[PDB]
Design a protein around this ligand. Structure first.
Ligand code: MET
Length: 523
């Protein structure tokens, strides 16, 4: 089934200015999207802001300004930030968008018509900061912004409060068995595996029905009214998850503004998401609530949910993304964030370690290799030479390069971006050691014919690795390709994953008096 490859980030609460967590989540979305574009697939990548709810309304209240003005302002900051981060996102959705609201109401009506919504009560704990319902097992003792004793969430340590309200309830309990059938029949649907196991365990234990409306006073009337009942507002999370369906149905102009909402998602061939990128803190909403709603409404389920080790949202200790990018570089910062962390919080995020990787991997491994195989001193004719016969050592390197695209492909599709970067750099380390071994600088004098072969393999190794790194180093890959003089046509497509796609005789790009890809940093 050829559809548009649909990849999403979460939509972020606009209670506060954007920070590194949002940038990280959206980066992963952007990288996956970029990889599928380089394979020559159709891609629609989605991000945005989650604008309704008690959390957000109370934050605007505390800034003494109207929700409308506050949300618009903060949304603007998210956009400026993401533009400044040089992503390639196809659309930025806001839950205040009038077309999104219509989609929420269509979905709600579908659920109601299906018989899965009834009027009941929620009497239990709620976390406003998480907009999450909690059972007594999931709270404990703590302190508020005062220092008075209170109950806090085990999930997140945020203050909880007791809620007793007549609410519309979704019959989530009825979806236990179907969700279980789904997890088992599609064992790649939640990544990484240990989070998939968490979800199954939780659903095995049983599911209560879920409150999908709240009394309007509680939400400071900042939410979507329930269809046919204006005394209730729709649960911010049902509203928010629906952004994925909304975005799948929006025709967007070349300026990035929405211009039209189609009736049927199949018209745009995006829905369901191929990959929802999320943080570990919002797994239940995406892997339990969302599929249950979709099953109720009769919509198709997502293919993969990937939950990274950071928190979607959190917190004298700062790490500004634009500030580190101006200091160290945008591509380098991105590389670091994707290289340092797997599916875990931990990871040395110090300046010390950022410099170690910049200098070690980007400068000494990658950049060193690019300069050497393009240098006037070694590549005396500034072209791709024609290879002479290959030794066994030559072929061992060629084999590594030939296998690399298959290996990196699989990693990108898990998706495990860290493992893909590590694969590419294993191959770059090999290319270096080959070059050390062959000493092509010595060959210019001694064996020009042997140099052709060595030089050709090196150039092609650098081209292939660079192509596979182009989703991670989008600007630098262009600079590298320009230096190698790679024609535009050979800068994407699975055709160009093959060894030898650029023919001998291709001319290198011009140089510049002083010119470094990644310049090293002091300590
Ligand atoms: C449908 S994704 C919603 C994510 C939520 N606004 C958060 O910041 O965690």
């Amino acid at each position: 089934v050829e559809k548009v490859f649909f990849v999403t980030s979460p939509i972020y609460y606009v209670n506060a200015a954007p920070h590194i967590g949002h940038v990280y989540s959206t980066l992963i979305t952007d990288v996956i999207g970029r990889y599928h574009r380089v394979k020559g697939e159709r891609v629609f990548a989605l991000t945005g802001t989650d604008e309704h709810g008690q959390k957000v309304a109370e934050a605007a209240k505390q800034k003494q300004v109207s929700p409308y003005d506050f949300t618009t302002a903060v949304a603007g900051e998210f956009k400026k930030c993401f533009e400044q981060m040089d992503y390639s996102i196809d659309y930025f959705i806001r839950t205040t968008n009038e077309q999104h609201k219509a989609v929420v109401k269509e979905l709600w009506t579908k659920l109601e018509q299906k018989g899965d919504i009834y009027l009941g009560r929620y009497e239990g704990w709620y976390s406003i900061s998480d907009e999450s319902f909690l059972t007594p097992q999931n709270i404990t003792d703590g302190v508020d912004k005062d220092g008075n004793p209170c109950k806090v969430s085990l999930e997140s340590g945020h203050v909880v409060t007791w809620v007793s309200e007549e609410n519309y309830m979704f019959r989530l309990s009825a979806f236990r068995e179907r969700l279980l059938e789904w997890y088992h029949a599609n064992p790649g649907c939640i990544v990484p595996e240990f989070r998939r196991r968490e979800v199954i365990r939780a659903v095995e234990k049983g599911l209560p029905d879920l409150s999908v409306s709240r009394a309007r006073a509680t939400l400071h009337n900042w939410a979507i009214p329930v269809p046919g009942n204006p005394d209730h507002c729709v649960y911010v999370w049902l509203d928010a998850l629906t952004n994925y369906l909304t975005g799948s149905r929006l025709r967007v102009d070349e300026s990035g503004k929405e211009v039209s909402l189609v009736d049927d998602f199949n018209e745009l061939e995006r829905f369901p998401a191929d990959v929802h990128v999320i943080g570990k803190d919002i797994l239940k909403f995406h892997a339990i609530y969302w599929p249950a709603f979709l099953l109720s409404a009769g919509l198709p389920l997502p293919k993969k949910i990937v939950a990274h080790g950071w928190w979607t949202k959190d917190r004298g200790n700062v790490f500004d993304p634009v500030e580190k990018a101006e200091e160290f570089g945008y591509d380098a910062l991105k590389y670091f964030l994707l290289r340092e962390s797997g599916f875990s919080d931990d990871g040395d995020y110090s300046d010390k370690n950022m410099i170690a990787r910049l200098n070690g991997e980007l400068a000494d491994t990658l950049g060193n290799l690019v300069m050497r195989c393009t240098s006037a001193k070694i590549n005396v004719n500034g072209e791709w030479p024609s290879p002479a016969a290959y030794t066994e050592e030559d072929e061992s390197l060629i084999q590594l390069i030939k296998d690399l695209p298959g290996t990196a492909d699989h990693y990108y599709l898990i998706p495990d971006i860290q493992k893909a970067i590590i694969a590419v750099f294993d191959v770059l380390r090999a290319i270096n050691a080959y070059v050390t071994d062959m000493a092509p600088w010595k060959l210019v004098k001694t064996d020009p014919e042997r140099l052709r072969t060595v030089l050709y393999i090196t150039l092609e190794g650098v081209r292939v690795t660079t192509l596979l790194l182009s989703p991670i180093l989008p600007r630098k890959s262009v600079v590298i390709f320009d230096m190698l003089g790679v024609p535009e046509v050979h800068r994407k497509g699975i055709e160009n994953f093959e060894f030898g796609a650029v023919p001998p005789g291709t001319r290198l790009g011009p140089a510049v008096e002083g010119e470094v890809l990644f310049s090293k940093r002091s300590t």
